[PDB]
């Protein structure tokens, strides 16, 4: 429902762990939406759901494959905002959050540089979700790029 495609890697203190393998005992790199600070915290819940539609955001080192009602996290003005994937409308003033290198350096890319595909999948597949106190956490795509994505509330 508010989930990420199976095999999405979640950045933890130890490395980049397949989301379907995350437990409540893992130390996940969260991003606090109120403070913009990075920290490792335990997820308070994990979710497994099977769906057949996906929103694929792709551009400029940003790649997320999410459920329709997954919370997308972006910066606008000086504030960190959320929007459901199916509702997100790119604009020059809304920026997705990339985390570059080993020092957790924030790079903000224009959402208008990110293509959005809404796909009906040929067959159902598993999507997974985490809840963390900061309400967002860092995922790593197939090309080693890290970005901030919404947690389930």
Coordinates of N, CA and C in Angstrom, one line a residue:
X1 N 0.9 -1.2 0.0 CA 0.0 0.0 0.0 C 0.9 1.3 0.0
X2 N 1.7 1.4 1.0 CA 2.7 2.5 1.2 C 4.1 1.9 1.2
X3 N 4.4 1.0 0.3 CA 5.5 0.0 0.4 C 6.5 0.3 -0.8
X4 N 7.7 -0.4 -0.7 CA 8.8 -0.3 -1.7 C 8.9 -1.7 -2.3
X5 N 9.2 -1.7 -3.6 CA 9.4 -3.0 -4.4 C 10.4 -3.9 -3.7
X6 N 10.1 -5.2 -3.6 CA 11.0 -6.2 -3.1 C 12.4 -6.0 -3.7
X7 N 13.5 -6.2 -2.9 CA 14.8 -6.1 -3.4 C 15.4 -4.7 -3.3
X8 N 14.6 -3.7 -3.1 CA 15.1 -2.4 -2.7 C 16.0 -2.5 -1.5
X9 N 17.2 -2.0 -1.6 CA 18.2 -2.1 -0.5 C 18.0 -0.9 0.5
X10 N 18.0 -1.2 1.8 CA 17.9 -0.2 2.8 C 19.3 0.0 3.5
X11 N 19.8 1.2 3.5 CA 21.1 1.5 4.1 C 21.0 1.3 5.7
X12 N 21.9 0.4 6.2 CA 22.0 0.1 7.6 C 23.4 0.5 8.1
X13 N 23.7 0.3 9.4 CA 25.0 0.6 10.0 C 26.1 -0.4 9.4
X14 N 25.7 -1.6 9.0 CA 26.6 -2.6 8.5 C 26.8 -2.6 7.0
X15 N 25.8 -2.1 6.3 CA 25.8 -2.1 4.8 C 24.5 -1.8 4.2
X16 N 24.3 -2.3 3.0 CA 23.0 -2.1 2.2 C 22.2 -3.5 2.1
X17 N 21.2 -3.5 2.9 CA 20.4 -4.8 3.2 C 19.1 -4.8 2.4
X18 N 18.8 -5.9 1.7 CA 17.5 -6.1 1.0 C 16.4 -5.8 1.9
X19 N 15.5 -5.0 1.6 CA 14.4 -4.5 2.4 C 13.6 -5.7 3.0
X20 N 13.4 -6.8 2.2 CA 12.7 -8.0 2.6 C 13.4 -8.7 3.8
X21 N 14.6 -8.4 4.0 CA 15.4 -9.0 5.1 C 15.6 -8.1 6.3
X22 N 15.1 -6.9 6.3 CA 15.1 -6.0 7.4 C 14.2 -6.5 8.6
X23 N 14.8 -6.6 9.8 CA 14.0 -6.9 11.0 C 14.0 -5.7 12.0
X24 N 13.3 -5.8 13.1 CA 13.2 -4.8 14.1 C 14.6 -4.6 14.8
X25 N 15.4 -5.6 14.7 CA 16.8 -5.6 15.3 C 17.9 -4.9 14.4
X26 N 17.5 -4.6 13.2 CA 18.5 -3.9 12.2 C 18.6 -2.4 12.6
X27 N 19.7 -1.8 12.3 CA 20.0 -0.4 12.6 C 20.0 0.4 11.3
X28 N 18.8 1.0 11.0 CA 18.5 1.6 9.7 C 18.9 3.1 9.7
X29 N 19.6 3.5 8.6 CA 19.9 5.0 8.5 C 18.6 5.7 8.2
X30 N 18.1 6.4 9.2 CA 16.9 7.3 9.1 C 17.3 8.7 8.8
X31 N 16.4 9.5 8.3 CA 16.5 11.0 8.1 C 15.3 11.6 8.8
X32 N 15.6 12.5 9.8 CA 14.6 13.1 10.6 C 14.0 14.3 9.8
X33 N 12.7 14.3 9.4 CA 12.1 15.3 8.6 C 12.1 16.7 9.2
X34 N 12.0 16.7 10.6 CA 11.9 18.0 11.3 C 13.3 18.6 11.5
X35 N 14.3 17.8 11.7 CA 15.7 18.3 12.0 C 16.7 18.2 10.8
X36 N 16.4 17.4 9.8 CA 17.3 17.1 8.7 C 18.5 16.3 9.1
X37 N 18.5 15.7 10.3 CA 19.7 15.0 10.8 C 19.5 13.5 10.4
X38 N 20.7 12.8 10.2 CA 20.8 11.4 9.9 C 21.2 10.7 11.2
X39 N 20.6 9.5 11.4 CA 20.9 8.6 12.6 C 20.5 7.2 12.3
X40 N 21.1 6.2 13.0 CA 20.7 4.8 12.9 C 19.7 4.5 14.1
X41 N 18.6 4.0 13.7 CA 17.5 3.6 14.7 C 16.9 2.2 14.2
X42 N 16.3 1.5 15.2 CA 15.6 0.3 14.9 C 14.2 0.6 14.3
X43 N 13.8 -0.1 13.2 CA 12.4 0.0 12.7 C 11.5 -0.4 13.8
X44 N 10.3 0.2 13.9 CA 9.3 -0.2 14.9 C 8.2 -1.1 14.3
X45 N 8.1 -1.1 12.9 CA 7.4 -2.2 12.2 C 7.9 -2.4 10.8
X46 N 7.8 -3.6 10.3 CA 8.0 -4.0 8.9 C 6.7 -4.6 8.4
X47 N 6.5 -4.4 7.1 CA 5.2 -4.8 6.4 C 5.5 -5.5 5.2
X48 N 4.8 -6.6 4.9 CA 4.9 -7.3 3.6 C 3.5 -7.3 3.0
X49 N 3.4 -6.8 1.7 CA 2.2 -6.7 0.9 C 2.5 -7.2 -0.5
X50 N 1.5 -7.7 -1.2 CA 1.6 -8.2 -2.6 C 0.7 -7.4 -3.5
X51 N 1.3 -6.6 -4.4 CA 0.5 -5.7 -5.3 C 1.0 -5.9 -6.7
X52 N 0.3 -5.2 -7.7 CA 0.6 -5.3 -9.1 C 0.6 -4.0 -9.8
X53 N 0.9 -2.9 -9.1 CA 1.1 -1.6 -9.7 C 2.2 -0.8 -8.9
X54 N 3.0 -0.1 -9.7 CA 4.2 0.5 -9.2 C 4.4 1.9 -9.8
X55 N 5.0 2.9 -9.0 CA 5.5 4.2 -9.5 C 7.0 4.2 -9.5
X56 N 7.6 4.3 -10.6 CA 9.1 4.2 -10.8 C 9.5 5.7 -11.1
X57 N 10.2 6.3 -10.2 CA 10.8 7.6 -10.3 C 12.3 7.4 -10.7
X58 N 12.7 8.0 -11.8 CA 14.1 7.8 -12.3 C 14.7 9.1 -12.9
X59 N 15.8 9.5 -12.5 CA 16.6 10.6 -13.1 C 17.7 11.1 -12.2
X60 N 18.9 11.4 -12.7 CA 20.0 12.1 -12.1 C 20.4 11.5 -10.8
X61 N 20.6 10.2 -10.7 CA 21.1 9.5 -9.6 C 20.0 9.1 -8.6
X62 N 18.8 9.5 -8.9 CA 17.6 9.1 -8.1 C 16.8 8.0 -8.8
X63 N 16.6 6.9 -8.1 CA 15.7 5.8 -8.6 C 15.0 5.1 -7.4
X64 N 13.7 5.2 -7.4 CA 12.8 4.6 -6.4 C 11.6 3.9 -7.1
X65 N 11.3 2.7 -6.7 CA 10.2 1.9 -7.2 C 9.3 1.6 -6.0
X66 N 8.1 2.3 -6.0 CA 7.3 2.4 -4.8 C 5.8 2.1 -5.2
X67 N 5.0 1.7 -4.2 CA 3.5 1.6 -4.3 C 2.9 2.9 -4.5
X68 N 1.6 2.9 -5.1 CA 0.9 4.2 -5.3 C 0.8 5.1 -4.1
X69 N 0.6 4.6 -2.9 CA 0.4 5.4 -1.7 C 1.7 5.5 -0.8
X70 N 2.8 5.1 -1.3 CA 4.1 5.3 -0.7 C 4.4 6.8 -0.5
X71 N 5.0 7.2 0.6 CA 5.3 8.6 0.9 C 6.6 8.9 0.2
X72 N 6.5 9.8 -0.7 CA 7.7 10.4 -1.4 C 8.1 11.6 -0.5
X73 N 9.5 11.8 -0.3 CA 10.1 12.8 0.6 C 10.9 13.7 -0.3
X74 N 10.6 15.0 -0.2 CA 11.3 16.0 -1.0 C 11.5 17.3 -0.1
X75 N 12.4 18.1 -0.5 CA 12.6 19.5 0.1 C 11.9 20.5 -0.8
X76 N 11.2 21.5 -0.2 CA 10.6 22.6 -0.9 C 10.8 23.8 0.1
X77 N 11.3 24.9 -0.4 CA 11.8 26.0 0.5 C 12.9 25.4 1.4
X78 N 12.8 25.7 2.7 CA 13.8 25.1 3.6 C 13.2 23.9 4.4
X79 N 12.0 23.4 4.0 CA 11.2 22.4 4.8 C 11.3 21.1 4.1
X80 N 11.2 20.0 4.8 CA 11.1 18.6 4.3 C 9.6 18.3 4.3
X81 N 9.1 17.9 3.1 CA 7.6 17.7 2.8 C 7.5 16.2 2.4
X82 N 6.2 15.7 2.5 CA 5.8 14.4 2.0 C 4.6 14.6 1.0
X83 N 4.5 13.6 0.1 CA 3.4 13.4 -0.9 C 3.3 12.0 -1.3
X84 N 2.1 11.4 -1.4 CA 1.9 10.1 -1.9 C 2.4 10.0 -3.4
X85 N 3.1 8.9 -3.7 CA 3.7 8.7 -5.1 C 2.7 9.0 -6.2
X86 N 1.5 8.5 -6.1 CA 0.4 8.7 -7.1 C 0.0 10.2 -7.3
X87 N 0.2 11.0 -6.3 CA -0.2 12.4 -6.2 C 1.0 13.3 -6.6
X88 N 2.2 12.9 -6.6 CA 3.4 13.7 -6.7 C 3.4 14.4 -8.1
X89 N 3.5 15.7 -8.1 CA 3.6 16.5 -9.4 C 5.0 17.3 -9.3
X90 N 5.9 16.9 -10.2 CA 7.2 17.5 -10.2 C 7.1 19.0 -10.5
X91 N 8.0 19.8 -9.9 CA 8.1 21.3 -10.1 C 9.6 21.6 -9.8
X92 N 10.0 22.8 -10.4 CA 11.4 23.3 -10.3 C 11.8 23.6 -8.8
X93 N 10.8 23.8 -8.0 CA 10.9 24.2 -6.6 C 10.8 23.1 -5.6
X94 N 10.6 21.8 -6.1 CA 10.6 20.6 -5.3 C 11.8 19.7 -5.6
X95 N 12.5 19.3 -4.6 CA 13.8 18.6 -4.8 C 13.8 17.3 -4.0
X96 N 14.2 16.2 -4.7 CA 14.4 14.9 -4.1 C 15.8 14.9 -3.5
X97 N 16.0 14.1 -2.5 CA 17.2 14.1 -1.6 C 18.1 12.9 -1.8
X98 N 19.2 13.1 -2.4 CA 20.3 12.1 -2.7 C 21.4 12.3 -1.6
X99 N 21.9 11.1 -1.1 CA 22.9 11.1 -0.1 C 24.2 10.5 -0.7
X100 N 25.2 11.4 -0.9 CA 26.4 11.1 -1.7 C 27.6 10.8 -0.9
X101 N 28.4 9.8 -1.3 CA 29.7 9.4 -0.6 C 29.4 8.6 0.7
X102 N 30.4 8.7 1.6 CA 30.5 8.0 2.9 C 30.1 8.9 4.1
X103 N 30.1 10.2 3.8 CA 30.0 11.3 4.8 C 28.5 11.8 4.9
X104 N 27.6 11.2 4.3 CA 26.1 11.5 4.3 C 25.9 12.9 3.8
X105 N 26.5 13.3 2.7 CA 26.4 14.6 2.0 C 25.1 14.7 1.2
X106 N 24.2 15.7 1.5 CA 22.9 15.8 0.9 C 23.1 16.6 -0.4
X107 N 22.6 16.0 -1.5 CA 22.5 16.6 -2.8 C 21.0 16.7 -3.2
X108 N 20.5 17.9 -3.5 CA 19.1 18.1 -3.8 C 19.0 18.3 -5.3
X109 N 18.2 17.4 -6.0 CA 18.0 17.4 -7.5 C 16.6 17.9 -7.8
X110 N 16.4 18.7 -8.8 CA 15.1 19.2 -9.2 C 14.2 18.0 -9.6
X111 N 13.0 17.9 -9.1 CA 12.1 16.8 -9.3 C 11.7 16.7 -10.8
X112 N 11.8 17.9 -11.5 CA 11.5 17.9 -13.0 C 12.6 17.2 -13.8
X113 N 13.7 16.8 -13.1 CA 14.8 16.0 -13.8 C 14.5 14.5 -13.6
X114 N 13.4 14.2 -12.9 CA 13.1 12.8 -12.6 C 11.8 12.4 -13.3
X115 N 11.9 11.4 -14.2 CA 10.8 10.8 -15.0 C 10.0 9.9 -14.0
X116 N 8.7 9.9 -14.2 CA 7.7 9.1 -13.4 C 7.0 8.2 -14.3
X117 N 7.1 6.9 -14.1 CA 6.3 5.8 -14.8 C 5.4 5.1 -13.8
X118 N 4.1 5.1 -14.1 CA 3.1 4.3 -13.4 C 2.8 3.0 -14.3
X119 N 3.1 1.9 -13.7 CA 3.1 0.6 -14.5 C 2.1 -0.4 -13.8
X120 N 1.3 -1.1 -14.5 CA 0.6 -2.3 -14.1 C 1.6 -3.4 -14.4
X121 N 2.0 -4.1 -13.3 CA 2.9 -5.3 -13.4 C 2.1 -6.5 -14.0
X122 N 2.9 -7.3 -14.8 CA 2.3 -8.5 -15.5 C 1.8 -9.5 -14.4
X123 N 2.5 -9.6 -13.3 CA 2.1 -10.5 -12.2 C 2.3 -9.8 -10.8
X124 N 1.5 -10.2 -9.8 CA 1.7 -9.6 -8.5 C 3.2 -9.9 -8.0
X125 N 3.7 -9.0 -7.2 CA 5.0 -9.2 -6.5 C 5.0 -8.5 -5.1
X126 N 5.9 -8.9 -4.2 CA 5.9 -8.4 -2.8 C 6.5 -7.0 -2.8
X127 N 5.9 -6.1 -2.0 CA 6.4 -4.8 -1.6 C 6.6 -4.8 -0.1
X128 N 7.6 -4.1 0.4 CA 7.9 -4.1 1.8 C 8.0 -2.6 2.3
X129 N 7.7 -2.4 3.6 CA 7.7 -1.1 4.2 C 8.3 -1.1 5.6
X130 N 8.9 0.0 6.1 CA 9.4 0.1 7.5 C 8.8 1.4 8.1
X131 N 8.6 1.4 9.4 CA 8.4 2.6 10.2 C 9.6 2.9 11.0
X132 N 10.1 4.1 11.0 CA 11.2 4.7 11.8 C 10.7 6.0 12.4
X133 N 11.2 6.3 13.6 CA 10.8 7.6 14.3 C 10.9 8.9 13.5
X134 N 12.0 9.0 12.6 CA 12.2 10.1 11.8 C 11.3 10.2 10.6
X135 N 10.5 9.2 10.3 CA 9.5 9.1 9.3 C 10.0 9.0 7.9
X136 N 11.4 8.8 7.7 CA 12.0 8.6 6.4 C 13.4 7.9 6.7
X137 N 13.8 7.1 5.7 CA 15.1 6.4 5.7 C 15.8 6.3 4.4
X138 N 17.1 5.9 4.3 CA 17.9 5.9 3.1 C 17.8 4.5 2.5
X139 N 17.6 4.5 1.1 CA 17.6 3.3 0.3 C 18.7 3.5 -0.7
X140 N 19.3 2.4 -1.2 CA 20.3 2.3 -2.2 C 19.7 1.5 -3.4
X141 N 19.8 2.1 -4.6 CA 19.3 1.6 -5.9 C 20.4 0.6 -6.5
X142 N 20.1 0.0 -7.6 CA 20.9 -1.0 -8.3 C 22.3 -0.4 -8.8
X143 N 22.4 0.9 -8.8 CA 23.6 1.7 -9.3 C 24.4 2.3 -8.1
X144 N 24.1 1.9 -6.9 CA 24.8 2.3 -5.7 C 24.4 3.7 -5.2
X145 N 23.4 4.3 -5.8 CA 23.0 5.7 -5.4 C 22.0 5.6 -4.2
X146 N 22.3 6.4 -3.2 CA 21.4 6.5 -2.0 C 20.5 7.7 -2.0
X147 N 19.3 7.6 -1.6 CA 18.3 8.7 -1.5 C 17.3 8.5 -0.3
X148 N 16.6 9.5 0.1 CA 15.7 9.5 1.2 C 14.3 9.1 0.6
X149 N 13.6 8.2 1.3 CA 12.3 7.8 0.9 C 11.4 7.7 2.2
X150 N 10.1 7.8 2.0 CA 9.2 7.8 3.2 C 9.1 6.5 3.9
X151 N 9.0 6.5 5.2 CA 8.6 5.4 6.0 C 7.0 5.3 6.1
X152 N 6.5 4.1 6.4 CA 5.0 4.0 6.7 C 4.7 4.5 8.0
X153 N 3.6 5.3 8.1 CA 3.2 6.0 9.4 C 2.3 5.1 10.3

